[PDB]
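User: Predict the complex.
Assistant: Input components as received:
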Amino acid sequence: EIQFLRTDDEVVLQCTATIHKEQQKLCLAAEGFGNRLCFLESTSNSKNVPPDLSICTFVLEQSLSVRALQEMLANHRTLLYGHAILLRHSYSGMYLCCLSTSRSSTDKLAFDVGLQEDTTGEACWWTIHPASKQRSEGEKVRVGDDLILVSVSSERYLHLSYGNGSLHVDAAFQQTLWSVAPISSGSEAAQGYLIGGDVLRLLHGHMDECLTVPSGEHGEEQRRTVHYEGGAVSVHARSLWRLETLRVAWSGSHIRWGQPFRLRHVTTGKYLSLMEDKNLLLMDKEKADVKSTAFTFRSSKEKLDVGVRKEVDGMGTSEIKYGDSVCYIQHVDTGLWLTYQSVDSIQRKAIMHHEGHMDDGISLSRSQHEESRTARVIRSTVFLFNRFIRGLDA
Amino acid sequence: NANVVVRLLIRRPECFGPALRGEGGNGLLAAMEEAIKIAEDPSRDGPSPEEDDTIHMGNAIMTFYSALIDLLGRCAPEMHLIHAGKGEAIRIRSILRSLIPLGDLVGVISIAFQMPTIAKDGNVVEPDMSAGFCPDHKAAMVLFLDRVYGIEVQDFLLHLLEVGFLPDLRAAASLDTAALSATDMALALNRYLCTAVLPLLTRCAPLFAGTEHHASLIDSLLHTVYRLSKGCSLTKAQRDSIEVCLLSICGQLRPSMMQHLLRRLVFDVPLLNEHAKMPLKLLTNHYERCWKYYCLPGGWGNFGAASEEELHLSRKLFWGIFDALSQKKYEQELFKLALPCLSAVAGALPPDYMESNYVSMMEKQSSMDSEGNF
């Protein structure tokens, strides 16, 4: 039984590009604050450079027919080909639209594609159309079908520009085949259980320690270490980690024991990793390899490995629960457990050990949407204002 | 049938031409300039191993682009649907506006023409029209301009008049000589103006409300239109169109900035020929409308006041018309149309008018002559 895309689901729009005779999969992305424009995020080199799907996820809010859309404009449904769909950017909460402005990349007959505050008007709405003759108008849209998006405001296809030096997405009269990948379904998500993409705090066995990094002393090299700390840092933003699965499709599904994932620091953008000298050190997006940045949750420290498992195309079963489950962090390749150094604002260093301690359990607390939003705002703003300061200094 | 054609053309953008497919396009104006250079270049215009003997590729490119622009402008939705707020009509107009920039439409109109020239022997050297830039090419530009973008703002109207519309009128007025009148280019230019430019300025007449410190441009336009109206090669329909256009413009124009045309009027009406019918009606309408500007010392501040020189000129007009009319033989239509004019001028002129004993010296012999008007 092939699944059908329906409203209130979370998806990412993917387009394939042939660059220097190399097939590369790209995802449409946008960052709410700072740049209303939309760009492209690569997801082909996931093994070496982890993609950022948090700014690529979109929510299908409304799916209306063309006639009904026109009527309301004058005044969990399943998507069928030919309906008008409203896409909401999951992070920003703003809607994809034809900006009616042109960046003029040698194509005068084109418009820019970005994000918009209001839902009113015909710019936010897009029409889905079959990619081949196998599909037809009114037919249900499968999860694996390719799609063509047409702007209601301008009848301009959601287009991928090969001609320009750096790949861009715009609204042009040439058509581009977009593939919709289901990220998560909120309806089939169990409340209180760990799902992929959550921003969470790693609480220690005493519930008053959280895995953090040193506070801001203007030293990014000192901010690269990882330690246990207690106090107000548990409600501060530097204790926030985003769990990122290694899969692109169904990344918002429930997290099971043994599932590899990457832990990203929200306020610094650096992924947790194990160095070759058995030391935890944050490293950059470009270097954040699967070999170093892969971690799993074990129900017990007992050595029986989870073994080979299949990834399932769905939300999956709910195994890890917030605040009622004891988890042990294990590096996938080395098998080392995460534990405190126990040497004597505790500043108890977090280290990797073959056996660890008996009180090495980690509790899970899910952060609030407000906290995650503010943390990503802080990261983006500090990056931009550091670029500004460097330019002024030059 | 217009929207569907718009769908089809936007789905296949290669129908728009190499200048406008969207990738590596030089633009409509650049294409028209490349075409007029190709038309001059003989290596590219002809095969180089009339129209069938030599298909001028420059003219072919220009007529293709003019036909595309004309088709798009005709595909533009009607004004009333836009006023009613029909979303699809608004969408079509926005698509066409995105397709064709305003500057490209302005530039093609700004492009000049090939001036017909008499020769040392007296024979007119005819530049071949089928091989060069044609008035119909600009006429299509005008149709797109007034059907898609719309001329609804005054400084835009004035800028367009200054850049592209006025020089064409001046060229038409310069080809008013008998030898140059029979030239095909003069006929084509006259048709283009009387079909596209004059009706446009007639429908956008209310925009001529405030043109105080563009006085020179509006005076030049009036003079050129009056000379073109005096032109002889014009047809009956062309005369009617230019009469309506001039009357509509002068009616909305403020009475202060039309004394310069009054001078020509007050000399040319007393001849009481067939050509005088339009100017004497124009005087009738002017003096019936702006009667308070003369009899009342002040009027509104916006009208201004009499300078006593236009007052002397109007009194001279009244007396000249009256005397020419008195020694003129009876013609029914001519007197029935002249009487309202004489009555209006008499009413506008103050009854107690101070006739200045100091009469004006050094009359404008150029505006005041027997032959050539220069």
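Chain A touches chain B at residues 70, 73-74, 100, 106-111, 122, 153-156, 163, 172-174 (CB under 8 Å).
Let me know if you want any component modeled separately.
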